[PDB]
Amino acid sequence: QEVVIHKIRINLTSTKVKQLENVSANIIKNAETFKLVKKGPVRLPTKVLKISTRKTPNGEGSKTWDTYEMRIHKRYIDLEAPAHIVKRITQITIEPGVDVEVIIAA
């Protein structure tokens, strides 16, 4: 009766990459099963967090450095689909590590 499409973006942010990919795949599969209009898994530029730190505590000896870094992986799945469907999706397909998140408002 409703069939009210709010236009819903699923964000998918993570560090672990393979896991994220798997999650995305799962989501896609779910969508296919439910048979909806959606834009495919858009992948955004991998933001890298860099922390340069002198390896030493005491600053004595040669001046050596360690670039410790964090990889951020950010994906978007845009669903032209209802509210109920979105809710259902949210309910099923949750894995550890990946930050599942929904915008909901076009």
């Binding site: 967090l49 922390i51 730190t53 410790y68 870094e69 964090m70």
Partner: protein, 53 residues
């Protein structure tokens, strides 16, 4: 109990303590870590930061 036991320590080296040691020395305040650099190094792997290149 005494009245004057506080200079205004809103900002600067004195305000910004670290989470672990509570030091004002080599304080990584980037990305809201607030960690003395040594401490960060010791834990960096657990906090998601890995050496690659």
């Amino acid at each position: 109990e005494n009245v004057w036991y506080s200079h205004p320590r809103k900002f600067g080296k004195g305000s910004r303590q670290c989470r672990i040691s509570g030091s004002h020395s080599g304080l990584i305040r980037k990305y809201g870590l607030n960690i003395d650099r040594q401490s960060f190094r010791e834990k960096a792997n657990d906090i998601g930061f890995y050496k690659y290149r």
